[PDB]
Amino acid sequence: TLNGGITDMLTELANFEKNVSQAIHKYNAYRKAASVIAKYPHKIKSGAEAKKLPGVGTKIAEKIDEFLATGKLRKLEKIRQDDTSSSINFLTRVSGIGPSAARKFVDEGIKTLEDLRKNEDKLNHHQRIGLKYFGDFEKRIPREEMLQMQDIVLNEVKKVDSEYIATVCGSFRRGAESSGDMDVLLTHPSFTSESTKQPKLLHQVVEQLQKVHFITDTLSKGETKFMGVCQLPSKNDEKEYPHRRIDIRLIPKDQYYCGVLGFTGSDIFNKNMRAHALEKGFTINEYTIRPLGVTGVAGEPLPVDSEKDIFDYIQWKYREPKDRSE
DNA sequence: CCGACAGCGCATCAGC
DNA sequence: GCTGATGCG
DNA sequence: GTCGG
Ligand SMILES: Nc1nc2c([nH]c(=O)n2[C@@H]2O[C@H](COP(=O)(O)OP(=O)(O)OP(=O)(O)O)[C@@H](O)[C@H]2O)c(=O)[nH]1
Ligand SMILES: *P(=O)(O)OC[C@@H]1CC[C@H](n2ccc(N)nc2=O)O1
Ligand SMILES: [Mn+2]
Ligand SMILES: [Mn+2]
Ligand code: NA
Ligand code: NA
Ligand code: NA
Ligand code: NA
């Protein structure tokens, strides 16, 4: 919060470029500058000072000066007053409605929560469910509730097959006191980079969580990735807990460490690390780290047995998950 | 100046 | 039905 | 929008 005013402005500009302008590289540029400023341990006094940080350039430096003088940014004040931009930005807040769909809906006169509810028939399943729980998905999850959810998931997974190993990652693994959702990594010795000796590995788990009424709806679902909705059970007479977003991802067991690194994040930390591995001649995804040859084509996976090994290959001093919330 | 910007699973549509 | 491109997160 | 080369 030391520079919360500046990071807020840059985040709003980023969302505008993504939702309205459909300029994804400007979106990431604003997010990168916002992340680097967010960890800068002084109260920024000027855009010149801010520009000394990597990722903050001339254009962002000028906007920081304006904000520090007046406390506002004219470019944003105009964007906030444009009904089309304002409607597009709102509709994208519904899960499954992206910049393209949002603009298409605004084009047809669908531009408010009310309009969306009248035209449920014009939404796909994902968007239909995002609308249904739009209000609940706006609330964060206290870490205490995350611990309750962790217990339910890990115990229900054990009851299907004691060989499962479910790991909660995301902001939870990074030590956050509150989370936007719950992210679950799943492994089973039957599923490795060498064979898939068991089918319906993920399905079995989803069905079990649906049986005990933990999972309440599904956004999408494939053989290795599930995105849906969950809800803690409420005690007698007390009010219902908010519905929550949950992702479950089954990963080959022998590739757990690249998977836990990828799903722990943060998303910006991933981008920074993966970009750096390229600078040093490697390519990292949630499964492996591979060397780049003379041509840039990926080589064979390198041996990995810990999160640190991946850091070693690219000459990075290891960083605890708590220190990866960029 | 200019090219690159991390990398991927699922849903949906167009084309054959 | 499959294959590729696009939207989405 | 930013930055290495
Ligand atoms: N949101 C987001 N997450 C990403 C991206 N790329 C990527 O690898 N991830 C990983 O996916 C994990 C789960 O997604 P998430 O949005 O819930 O991230 P989070 O747990 O840190 O934040 P949260 O507290 O709002 O839930 C992230 O921690 C991150 O490691 C991305 O582009 N956007
Ligand atoms: P969603 O649940 O609303 O956003 C969460 C997930 C986590 C990663 C995924 N994501 C988002 C954007 C991009 N570019 N790549 C991703 O994997 O959104
Ligand atoms: Mn999360
Ligand atoms: Mn998530
Ligand atoms: Na800079
Ligand atoms: Na959305
Ligand atoms: Na979030
Ligand atoms: Na609810």
mmCIF file of C-alpha atoms in Angstrom, chain A residues 5-318:
data_model
loop_
_atom_site.group_PDB
_atom_site.id
_atom_site.type_symbol
_atom_site.label_atom_id
_atom_site.label_comp_id
_atom_site.label_asym_id
_atom_site.label_seq_id
_atom_site.Cartn_x
_atom_site.Cartn_y
_atom_site.Cartn_z
ATOM 1 C CA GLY A 5 -2.466 4.829 -5.420
ATOM 2 C CA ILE A 6 0.007 4.316 -8.262
ATOM 3 C CA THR A 7 -0.415 0.545 -8.471
ATOM 4 C CA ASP A 8 -4.204 0.933 -8.533
ATOM 5 C CA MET A 9 -4.045 3.369 -11.453
ATOM 6 C CA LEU A 10 -1.726 1.085 -13.417
ATOM 7 C CA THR A 11 -3.971 -1.905 -12.717
ATOM 8 C CA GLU A 12 -7.013 -0.002 -13.991
ATOM 9 C CA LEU A 13 -5.092 0.968 -17.127
ATOM 10 C CA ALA A 14 -4.081 -2.675 -17.569
ATOM 11 C CA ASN A 15 -7.684 -3.865 -17.295
ATOM 12 C CA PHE A 16 -8.730 -1.212 -19.817
ATOM 13 C CA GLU A 17 -6.140 -2.352 -22.357
ATOM 14 C CA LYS A 18 -7.215 -5.972 -21.886
ATOM 15 C CA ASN A 19 -11.000 -5.627 -21.744
ATOM 16 C CA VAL A 20 -11.622 -2.647 -24.057
ATOM 17 C CA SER A 21 -8.545 -2.217 -26.278
ATOM 18 C CA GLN A 22 -7.765 -5.950 -26.567
ATOM 19 C CA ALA A 23 -4.045 -5.091 -26.336
ATOM 20 C CA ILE A 24 -2.662 -7.982 -24.315
ATOM 21 C CA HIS A 25 0.966 -6.831 -24.370
ATOM 22 C CA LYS A 26 0.002 -3.437 -22.947
ATOM 23 C CA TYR A 27 -1.994 -5.299 -20.291
ATOM 24 C CA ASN A 28 1.095 -7.275 -19.265
ATOM 25 C CA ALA A 29 3.302 -4.175 -19.447
ATOM 26 C CA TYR A 30 1.035 -2.323 -17.009
ATOM 27 C CA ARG A 31 0.863 -5.375 -14.744
ATOM 28 C CA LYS A 32 4.653 -5.790 -14.735
ATOM 29 C CA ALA A 33 5.227 -2.130 -13.860
ATOM 30 C CA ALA A 34 2.553 -2.373 -11.161
ATOM 31 C CA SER A 35 4.205 -5.452 -9.645
ATOM 32 C CA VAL A 36 7.705 -3.949 -9.582
ATOM 33 C CA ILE A 37 6.387 -0.728 -8.029
ATOM 34 C CA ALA A 38 4.351 -2.696 -5.478
ATOM 35 C CA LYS A 39 7.527 -4.165 -3.949
ATOM 36 C CA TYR A 40 9.645 -0.996 -4.224
ATOM 37 C CA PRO A 41 10.217 -0.211 -0.521
ATOM 38 C CA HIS A 42 10.020 3.600 -0.675
ATOM 39 C CA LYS A 43 7.131 5.991 -1.220
ATOM 40 C CA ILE A 44 7.691 7.007 -4.836
ATOM 41 C CA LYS A 45 8.251 10.768 -4.958
ATOM 42 C CA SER A 46 8.485 11.185 -8.739
ATOM 43 C CA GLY A 47 8.182 9.444 -12.076
ATOM 44 C CA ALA A 48 11.924 9.898 -12.555
ATOM 45 C CA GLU A 49 12.516 7.750 -9.471
ATOM 46 C CA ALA A 50 9.923 5.217 -10.628
ATOM 47 C CA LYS A 51 11.546 5.004 -14.066
ATOM 48 C CA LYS A 52 14.713 3.640 -12.446
ATOM 49 C CA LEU A 53 12.802 0.375 -11.906
ATOM 50 C CA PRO A 54 12.844 -2.191 -14.743
ATOM 51 C CA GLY A 55 9.495 -2.232 -16.528
ATOM 52 C CA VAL A 56 8.660 1.420 -15.809
ATOM 53 C CA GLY A 57 9.342 3.505 -18.906
ATOM 54 C CA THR A 58 8.739 7.033 -20.125
ATOM 55 C CA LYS A 59 4.981 6.737 -20.645
ATOM 56 C CA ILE A 60 4.298 5.275 -17.199
ATOM 57 C CA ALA A 61 6.679 7.823 -15.665
ATOM 58 C CA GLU A 62 4.611 10.696 -17.060
ATOM 59 C CA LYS A 63 1.387 9.176 -15.723
ATOM 60 C CA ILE A 64 2.938 8.730 -12.272
ATOM 61 C CA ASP A 65 3.893 12.414 -12.167
ATOM 62 C CA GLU A 66 0.354 13.482 -13.083
ATOM 63 C CA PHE A 67 -1.140 11.227 -10.411
ATOM 64 C CA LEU A 68 1.221 12.485 -7.703
ATOM 65 C CA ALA A 69 0.423 16.127 -8.487
ATOM 66 C CA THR A 70 -3.376 15.980 -8.788
ATOM 67 C CA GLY A 71 -4.294 12.608 -7.297
ATOM 68 C CA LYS A 72 -6.097 11.612 -10.510
ATOM 69 C CA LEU A 73 -5.405 10.554 -14.094
ATOM 70 C CA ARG A 74 -7.406 12.273 -16.828
ATOM 71 C CA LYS A 75 -7.117 9.287 -19.179
ATOM 72 C CA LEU A 76 -8.889 7.150 -16.572
ATOM 73 C CA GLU A 77 -11.497 9.795 -15.737
ATOM 74 C CA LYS A 78 -12.516 9.793 -19.404
ATOM 75 C CA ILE A 79 -12.545 5.988 -19.599
ATOM 76 C CA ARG A 80 -14.717 5.850 -16.476
ATOM 77 C CA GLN A 81 -17.295 8.113 -18.154
ATOM 78 C CA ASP A 82 -17.516 6.202 -21.457
ATOM 79 C CA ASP A 83 -20.617 4.013 -21.251
ATOM 80 C CA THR A 84 -19.415 1.427 -23.779
ATOM 81 C CA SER A 85 -15.983 1.036 -22.182
ATOM 82 C CA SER A 86 -17.698 1.070 -18.785
ATOM 83 C CA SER A 87 -20.194 -1.616 -19.820
ATOM 84 C CA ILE A 88 -17.515 -3.772 -21.460
ATOM 85 C CA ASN A 89 -15.360 -3.583 -18.335
ATOM 86 C CA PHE A 90 -18.294 -4.632 -16.152
ATOM 87 C CA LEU A 91 -19.381 -7.611 -18.252
ATOM 88 C CA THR A 92 -15.853 -9.060 -18.310
ATOM 89 C CA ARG A 93 -16.124 -9.421 -14.522
ATOM 90 C CA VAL A 94 -18.400 -12.435 -15.137
ATOM 91 C CA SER A 95 -16.423 -15.663 -15.454
ATOM 92 C CA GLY A 96 -16.503 -16.908 -19.032
ATOM 93 C CA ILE A 97 -17.283 -13.467 -20.477
ATOM 94 C CA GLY A 98 -14.057 -12.234 -22.040
ATOM 95 C CA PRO A 99 -13.273 -9.015 -23.909
ATOM 96 C CA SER A 100 -14.738 -10.430 -27.145
ATOM 97 C CA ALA A 101 -17.999 -11.719 -25.661
ATOM 98 C CA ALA A 102 -18.399 -8.586 -23.534
ATOM 99 C CA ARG A 103 -18.183 -6.307 -26.578
ATOM 100 C CA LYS A 104 -20.563 -8.562 -28.516
ATOM 101 C CA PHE A 105 -23.077 -8.465 -25.656
ATOM 102 C CA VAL A 106 -22.837 -4.673 -25.370
ATOM 103 C CA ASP A 107 -23.373 -4.455 -29.134
ATOM 104 C CA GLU A 108 -26.725 -6.245 -28.750
ATOM 105 C CA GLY A 109 -27.941 -4.058 -25.875
ATOM 106 C CA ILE A 110 -26.917 -6.436 -23.069
ATOM 107 C CA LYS A 111 -24.958 -4.166 -20.735
ATOM 108 C CA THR A 112 -26.127 -4.636 -17.121
ATOM 109 C CA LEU A 113 -26.488 -7.413 -14.580
ATOM 110 C CA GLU A 114 -30.247 -7.099 -15.123
ATOM 111 C CA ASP A 115 -29.894 -7.513 -18.894
ATOM 112 C CA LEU A 116 -27.705 -10.587 -18.397
ATOM 113 C CA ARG A 117 -30.341 -12.213 -16.186
ATOM 114 C CA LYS A 118 -33.065 -11.581 -18.775
ATOM 115 C CA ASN A 119 -30.947 -13.168 -21.535
ATOM 116 C CA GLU A 120 -29.652 -16.280 -19.768
ATOM 117 C CA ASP A 121 -30.509 -18.236 -22.926
ATOM 118 C CA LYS A 122 -27.734 -16.377 -24.789
ATOM 119 C CA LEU A 123 -24.903 -17.594 -22.518
ATOM 120 C CA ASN A 124 -22.794 -20.724 -22.734
ATOM 121 C CA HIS A 125 -22.510 -23.004 -19.709
ATOM 122 C CA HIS A 126 -19.392 -21.359 -18.265
ATOM 123 C CA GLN A 127 -20.903 -17.879 -18.560
ATOM 124 C CA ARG A 128 -24.245 -19.123 -17.228
ATOM 125 C CA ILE A 129 -22.534 -20.342 -14.048
ATOM 126 C CA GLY A 130 -20.372 -17.239 -13.678
ATOM 127 C CA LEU A 131 -23.505 -15.091 -13.736
ATOM 128 C CA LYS A 132 -25.254 -17.380 -11.242
ATOM 129 C CA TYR A 133 -22.509 -16.900 -8.629
ATOM 130 C CA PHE A 134 -21.256 -13.462 -9.719
ATOM 131 C CA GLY A 135 -21.931 -11.954 -6.300
ATOM 132 C CA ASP A 136 -20.305 -14.780 -4.349
ATOM 133 C CA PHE A 137 -17.227 -14.906 -6.595
ATOM 134 C CA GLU A 138 -16.596 -11.256 -5.649
ATOM 135 C CA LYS A 139 -15.816 -12.142 -2.018
ATOM 136 C CA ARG A 140 -12.380 -13.294 -0.903
ATOM 137 C CA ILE A 141 -11.777 -16.418 1.189
ATOM 138 C CA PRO A 142 -10.314 -15.993 4.695
ATOM 139 C CA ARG A 143 -7.404 -18.350 5.244
ATOM 140 C CA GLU A 144 -9.386 -20.018 8.035
ATOM 141 C CA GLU A 145 -12.003 -21.079 5.486
ATOM 142 C CA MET A 146 -9.221 -22.172 3.126
ATOM 143 C CA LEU A 147 -7.979 -24.520 5.851
ATOM 144 C CA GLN A 148 -11.467 -26.003 6.235
ATOM 145 C CA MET A 149 -11.690 -26.512 2.470
ATOM 146 C CA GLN A 150 -8.211 -28.059 2.374
ATOM 147 C CA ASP A 151 -9.311 -30.603 4.986
ATOM 148 C CA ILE A 152 -12.464 -31.556 3.070
ATOM 149 C CA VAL A 153 -10.663 -31.963 -0.260
ATOM 150 C CA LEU A 154 -7.648 -33.875 1.056
ATOM 151 C CA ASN A 155 -9.820 -36.213 3.133
ATOM 152 C CA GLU A 156 -12.370 -36.872 0.384
ATOM 153 C CA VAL A 157 -9.505 -37.603 -2.018
ATOM 154 C CA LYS A 158 -8.039 -40.130 0.425
ATOM 155 C CA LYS A 159 -11.429 -41.888 0.538
ATOM 156 C CA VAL A 160 -11.365 -42.568 -3.220
ATOM 157 C CA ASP A 161 -7.817 -43.968 -3.313
ATOM 158 C CA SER A 162 -5.146 -43.541 -0.628
ATOM 159 C CA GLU A 163 -2.565 -43.233 -3.432
ATOM 160 C CA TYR A 164 -3.812 -39.756 -4.379
ATOM 161 C CA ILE A 165 -1.774 -36.793 -3.156
ATOM 162 C CA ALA A 166 -3.668 -33.492 -3.251
ATOM 163 C CA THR A 167 -1.685 -30.285 -2.747
ATOM 164 C CA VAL A 168 -3.253 -26.851 -2.348
ATOM 165 C CA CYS A 169 -1.160 -24.196 -4.088
ATOM 166 C CA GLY A 170 -1.891 -20.795 -5.462
ATOM 167 C CA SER A 171 -1.886 -17.883 -3.053
ATOM 168 C CA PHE A 172 -2.629 -20.340 -0.228
ATOM 169 C CA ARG A 173 0.767 -22.021 -0.584
ATOM 170 C CA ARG A 174 2.301 -18.524 -0.770
ATOM 171 C CA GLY A 175 1.030 -17.847 2.758
ATOM 172 C CA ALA A 176 -1.729 -15.396 1.845
ATOM 173 C CA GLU A 177 -4.147 -14.476 4.629
ATOM 174 C CA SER A 178 -6.972 -14.479 2.055
ATOM 175 C CA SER A 179 -7.458 -16.145 -1.313
ATOM 176 C CA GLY A 180 -9.527 -15.448 -4.391
ATOM 177 C CA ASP A 181 -10.100 -19.180 -4.914
ATOM 178 C CA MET A 182 -8.678 -22.616 -4.101
ATOM 179 C CA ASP A 183 -6.159 -24.289 -6.418
ATOM 180 C CA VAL A 184 -5.593 -28.033 -6.045
ATOM 181 C CA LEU A 185 -2.798 -30.114 -7.564
ATOM 182 C CA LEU A 186 -3.496 -33.842 -7.889
ATOM 183 C CA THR A 187 -1.125 -36.751 -8.479
ATOM 184 C CA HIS A 188 -1.577 -40.512 -8.572
ATOM 185 C CA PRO A 189 1.165 -43.118 -9.148
ATOM 186 C CA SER A 190 -0.960 -44.551 -11.985
ATOM 187 C CA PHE A 191 -0.399 -41.366 -14.037
ATOM 188 C CA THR A 192 3.184 -40.590 -15.066
ATOM 189 C CA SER A 193 4.986 -39.150 -18.076
ATOM 190 C CA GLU A 194 5.440 -42.775 -19.114
ATOM 191 C CA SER A 195 1.886 -44.180 -19.091
ATOM 192 C CA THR A 196 -1.712 -43.589 -18.001
ATOM 193 C CA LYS A 197 -2.449 -46.913 -16.300
ATOM 194 C CA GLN A 198 -5.775 -45.710 -14.853
ATOM 195 C CA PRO A 199 -8.651 -43.858 -16.557
ATOM 196 C CA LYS A 200 -11.153 -41.479 -14.957
ATOM 197 C CA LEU A 201 -8.549 -40.460 -12.366
ATOM 198 C CA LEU A 202 -9.814 -36.876 -12.182
ATOM 199 C CA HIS A 203 -13.464 -37.806 -12.775
ATOM 200 C CA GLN A 204 -13.487 -40.140 -9.763
ATOM 201 C CA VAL A 205 -12.382 -37.249 -7.550
ATOM 202 C CA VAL A 206 -14.883 -34.739 -8.950
ATOM 203 C CA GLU A 207 -17.766 -37.178 -8.464
ATOM 204 C CA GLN A 208 -16.769 -37.805 -4.841
ATOM 205 C CA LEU A 209 -16.613 -34.078 -4.073
ATOM 206 C CA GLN A 210 -19.990 -33.697 -5.781
ATOM 207 C CA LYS A 211 -21.464 -36.577 -3.761
ATOM 208 C CA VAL A 212 -20.782 -34.918 -0.375
ATOM 209 C CA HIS A 213 -22.137 -31.665 -1.843
ATOM 210 C CA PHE A 214 -18.800 -29.840 -1.772
ATOM 211 C CA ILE A 215 -18.671 -29.234 -5.532
ATOM 212 C CA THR A 216 -21.913 -27.563 -6.617
ATOM 213 C CA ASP A 217 -21.337 -26.731 -10.301
ATOM 214 C CA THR A 218 -18.882 -27.160 -13.163
ATOM 215 C CA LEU A 219 -17.416 -24.460 -15.392
ATOM 216 C CA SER A 220 -15.295 -26.803 -17.536
ATOM 217 C CA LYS A 221 -13.895 -30.297 -17.148
ATOM 218 C CA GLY A 222 -11.349 -32.382 -19.038
ATOM 219 C CA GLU A 223 -9.239 -35.469 -18.350
ATOM 220 C CA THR A 224 -6.638 -33.460 -16.391
ATOM 221 C CA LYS A 225 -8.155 -30.041 -15.558
ATOM 222 C CA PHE A 226 -11.363 -29.209 -13.682
ATOM 223 C CA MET A 227 -12.797 -25.736 -13.085
ATOM 224 C CA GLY A 228 -15.934 -25.418 -10.995
ATOM 225 C CA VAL A 229 -17.654 -24.218 -7.844
ATOM 226 C CA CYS A 230 -17.535 -25.301 -4.206
ATOM 227 C CA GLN A 231 -19.183 -24.397 -0.882
ATOM 228 C CA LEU A 232 -18.350 -25.182 2.727
ATOM 229 C CA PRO A 233 -21.188 -26.848 4.659
ATOM 230 C CA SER A 234 -22.934 -24.531 7.098
ATOM 231 C CA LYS A 235 -23.745 -25.387 10.707
ATOM 232 C CA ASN A 236 -27.301 -25.568 12.031
ATOM 233 C CA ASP A 237 -29.264 -22.346 11.477
ATOM 234 C CA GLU A 238 -26.212 -20.266 10.611
ATOM 235 C CA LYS A 239 -26.210 -18.570 7.220
ATOM 236 C CA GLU A 240 -24.724 -20.205 4.133
ATOM 237 C CA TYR A 241 -21.089 -19.683 3.203
ATOM 238 C CA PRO A 242 -20.436 -17.944 -0.133
ATOM 239 C CA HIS A 243 -19.943 -20.146 -3.168
ATOM 240 C CA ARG A 244 -16.281 -20.381 -4.174
ATOM 241 C CA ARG A 245 -14.194 -21.102 -7.264
ATOM 242 C CA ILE A 246 -12.062 -24.255 -7.294
ATOM 243 C CA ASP A 247 -9.559 -25.575 -9.843
ATOM 244 C CA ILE A 248 -8.258 -29.155 -9.824
ATOM 245 C CA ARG A 249 -5.355 -30.200 -12.047
ATOM 246 C CA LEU A 250 -4.022 -33.737 -12.379
ATOM 247 C CA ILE A 251 -0.282 -33.818 -13.130
ATOM 248 C CA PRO A 252 2.081 -36.699 -13.996
ATOM 249 C CA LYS A 253 3.556 -37.843 -10.697
ATOM 250 C CA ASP A 254 7.169 -37.711 -11.876
ATOM 251 C CA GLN A 255 6.674 -34.023 -12.817
ATOM 252 C CA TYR A 256 5.291 -32.834 -9.476
ATOM 253 C CA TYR A 257 7.950 -30.209 -8.814
ATOM 254 C CA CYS A 258 7.557 -28.245 -12.053
ATOM 255 C CA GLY A 259 3.812 -28.538 -11.503
ATOM 256 C CA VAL A 260 3.870 -27.200 -7.948
ATOM 257 C CA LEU A 261 6.171 -24.379 -9.065
ATOM 258 C CA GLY A 262 3.831 -23.479 -11.921
ATOM 259 C CA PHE A 263 0.606 -23.663 -9.908
ATOM 260 C CA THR A 264 2.066 -21.817 -6.913
ATOM 261 C CA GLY A 265 2.864 -18.712 -8.946
ATOM 262 C CA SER A 266 2.185 -16.022 -8.696
ATOM 263 C CA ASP A 267 1.270 -15.529 -12.354
ATOM 264 C CA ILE A 268 3.691 -12.607 -12.668
ATOM 265 C CA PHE A 269 6.412 -14.540 -10.836
ATOM 266 C CA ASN A 270 5.890 -17.354 -13.345
ATOM 267 C CA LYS A 271 6.204 -14.953 -16.284
ATOM 268 C CA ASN A 272 9.368 -13.391 -14.857
ATOM 269 C CA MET A 273 10.990 -16.748 -14.090
ATOM 270 C CA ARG A 274 10.037 -18.312 -17.428
ATOM 271 C CA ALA A 275 11.311 -15.250 -19.288
ATOM 272 C CA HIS A 276 14.602 -15.480 -17.388
ATOM 273 C CA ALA A 277 15.014 -19.192 -18.126
ATOM 274 C CA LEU A 278 14.792 -18.297 -21.816
ATOM 275 C CA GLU A 279 17.513 -15.673 -21.350
ATOM 276 C CA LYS A 280 19.730 -18.442 -19.916
ATOM 277 C CA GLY A 281 18.810 -21.106 -22.484
ATOM 278 C CA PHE A 282 15.894 -23.072 -21.031
ATOM 279 C CA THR A 283 12.127 -23.391 -21.389
ATOM 280 C CA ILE A 284 9.968 -24.063 -18.323
ATOM 281 C CA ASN A 285 6.347 -25.182 -18.294
ATOM 282 C CA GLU A 286 4.248 -26.815 -15.569
ATOM 283 C CA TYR A 287 5.663 -30.229 -16.584
ATOM 284 C CA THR A 288 9.381 -29.890 -17.352
ATOM 285 C CA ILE A 289 12.384 -27.655 -17.908
ATOM 286 C CA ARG A 290 14.145 -28.260 -21.214
ATOM 287 C CA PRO A 291 17.251 -26.848 -22.902
ATOM 288 C CA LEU A 292 17.092 -24.712 -26.027
ATOM 289 C CA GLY A 293 19.411 -25.725 -28.851
ATOM 290 C CA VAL A 294 21.122 -23.650 -31.514
ATOM 291 C CA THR A 295 17.697 -23.405 -33.184
ATOM 292 C CA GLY A 296 15.550 -22.682 -30.131
ATOM 293 C CA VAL A 297 13.879 -26.096 -30.333
ATOM 294 C CA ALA A 298 13.385 -27.666 -26.920
ATOM 295 C CA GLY A 299 15.654 -30.544 -25.959
ATOM 296 C CA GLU A 300 14.837 -33.438 -23.685
ATOM 297 C CA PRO A 301 13.562 -32.825 -20.137
ATOM 298 C CA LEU A 302 16.275 -32.211 -17.558
ATOM 299 C CA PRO A 303 16.351 -34.174 -14.285
ATOM 300 C CA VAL A 304 14.393 -32.429 -11.526
ATOM 301 C CA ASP A 305 13.827 -33.574 -7.938
ATOM 302 C CA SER A 306 12.951 -30.331 -6.124
ATOM 303 C CA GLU A 307 11.738 -26.802 -6.720
ATOM 304 C CA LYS A 308 15.305 -25.636 -6.094
ATOM 305 C CA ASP A 309 16.743 -27.720 -8.944
ATOM 306 C CA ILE A 310 14.716 -25.632 -11.397
ATOM 307 C CA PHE A 311 16.140 -22.486 -9.797
ATOM 308 C CA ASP A 312 19.667 -23.898 -10.114
ATOM 309 C CA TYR A 313 19.418 -24.585 -13.854
ATOM 310 C CA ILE A 314 18.696 -20.891 -14.505
ATOM 311 C CA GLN A 315 21.126 -19.487 -11.904
ATOM 312 C CA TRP A 316 18.479 -18.126 -9.532
ATOM 313 C CA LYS A 317 18.880 -18.233 -5.772
ATOM 314 C CA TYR A 318 15.967 -20.213 -4.370
#
